[PDB]
Design a binder for this molecule. Structure first.
Ligand SMILES: *[C@H]1c2c(cc3ccc4cccc5ccc2c3c45)[C@@H](O)[C@H](O)[C@@H]1O
Ligand SMILES: [Ca+2]
Ligand SMILES: [Ca+2]
Length: 341
DNA sequence: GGGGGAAGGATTAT
DNA sequence: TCATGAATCCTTCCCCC
């Protein structure tokens, strides 16, 4: 299997630069403003001019403005980015029908039937890079390797505006030298738990016994790291289907008074049904973000599709179950739909 | 025992 | 005084043959 992974560089920030080229060279910070208070929310992404100074995805906008008060802070325009993304994804389908769109700015292409060796692949990668740049003015990073994971790692090493191949030999070196924390799917919590087990590189997962790994990081993650260490990972590039869709809204003030919360929830449902866009869910979950920012949720699965009306009444019952089983105040209240017909 | 699948907290990446 | 203008992951837990 020969895999070509495309990762659009600082995508939201880049798209804003394309739509307003005068931003190029300036620190650009794309944020999600929550509404709770002045500059409350989080940074969705920052271009490298802003990243240099520590402004990166996930940090509070207030924290970012204390570092770069003069940087350009733009509200996230998801719809715009999604459309530019769709167009780029379409360009990618012209190089391979076997495409897995992992997210709005990442895609895996199984180009096995299209290229013979890694030299080909690389040339295709440069062709893909140039095409996107020409058609959309977006620079991407291409990662090429034997499976989806190393192609992603390849891209992680080559970004931004890069292209890296990791041949069957460098894979073996990485299985020994790469910080296991740099492996896709292993976030801060699993990394730290692996550290306490004594595992720091992929090869180490082989020295530990399975039941110990399984107990610490979980069966799924355990088999995954082991398969990677054994150089046996070969998951197929497949079409990804969004499994759940939701809407979470911030309330004007923290509450646990059902009638104060209701409007927000109902609006969340009303807007969720629009994003469902034809999809009919058989499951619904009411999500409550408490005052200490913890998450509590309650859901129910139906033997049939859920109508907006059924959603309205069931959500209230579910929200009551939250307020009943959890005593904290609700900051944000949302709904989530899944198990589509 | 384990297929199946529901529930919901845990985790990842932005 | 945090959001993904969340979504998925994935571990229980339970029914039931
Ligand atoms: C934000 C997002 C998306 C889809 C929709 C669809 C319909 C909406 C109606 C009203 C409000 C609203 C807010 C955010 C939305 C909406 C709506 C997604 O396509 C996007 O990825 C974000 O989740
Ligand atoms: Ca990216
Ligand atoms: Ca990404």
């Amino acid at each position: 299997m020969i895999v070509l992974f495309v990762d659009f560089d600082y995508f939201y920030a880049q798209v804003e630069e394309v739509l307003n080229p005068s931003l190029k060279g300036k620190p650009v910070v794309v944020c999600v403003f929550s509404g709770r208070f002045e500059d409350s929310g989080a940074v969705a992404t920052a271009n490298y001019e802003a990243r240099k100074f520590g402004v990166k995805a996930g940090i509070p906008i207030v924290e970012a403005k204390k570092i770069l008060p003069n940087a350009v802070y733009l509200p996230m325009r998801k719809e715009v980015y999604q459309q530019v993304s769709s167009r780029i994804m379409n360009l990618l389908r012209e190089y391979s029908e076997k495409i897995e769109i992992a997210s709005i700015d990442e895609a895996y292409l199984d180009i096995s039937d299209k290229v013979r060796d890694y030299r080909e692949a690389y040339n295709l990668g440069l062709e893909i890079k140039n095409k996107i740049l020409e058609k959309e003015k977006i620079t991407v990073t291409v990662g090429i390797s034997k499976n989806k994971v190393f192609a992603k790692i390849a891209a992680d090493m080559a970004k931004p505006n890069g292209i890296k191949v990791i041949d069957d030999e460098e894979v073996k070196r990485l299985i020994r030298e790469l910080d296991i924390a740099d492996v896709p799917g292993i976030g801060n919590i699993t990394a730290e738990k692996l550290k306490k087990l004594g595992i720091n590189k992929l090869v180490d997962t082989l020295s530990i016994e399975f039941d110990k790994l399984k107990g610490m990081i979980g069966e799924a993650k355990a088999k995954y790291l082991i398969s990677l260490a054994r150089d046996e990972y070969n998951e197929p590039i497949r079409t990804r289907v969004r499994k759940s869709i939701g809407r979470i809204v911030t309330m004007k003030r923290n509450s646990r008074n059902l009638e104060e919360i209701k409007p927000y929830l109902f609006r969340a449902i009303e807007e969720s049904y629009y994003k469902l866009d034809k999809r009919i869910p058989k499951a619904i979950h009411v999500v409550a973000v408490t005052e200490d920012l913890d998450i509590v949720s309650r859901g129910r699965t139906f033997p049939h599709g859920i109508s907006k009306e059924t959603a309205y009444s069931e959500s209230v019952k579910l929200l009551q179950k939250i307020l009943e089983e959890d005593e904290r105040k609700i900051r944000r209240i949302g709904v989530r739909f899944s198990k589509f017909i």
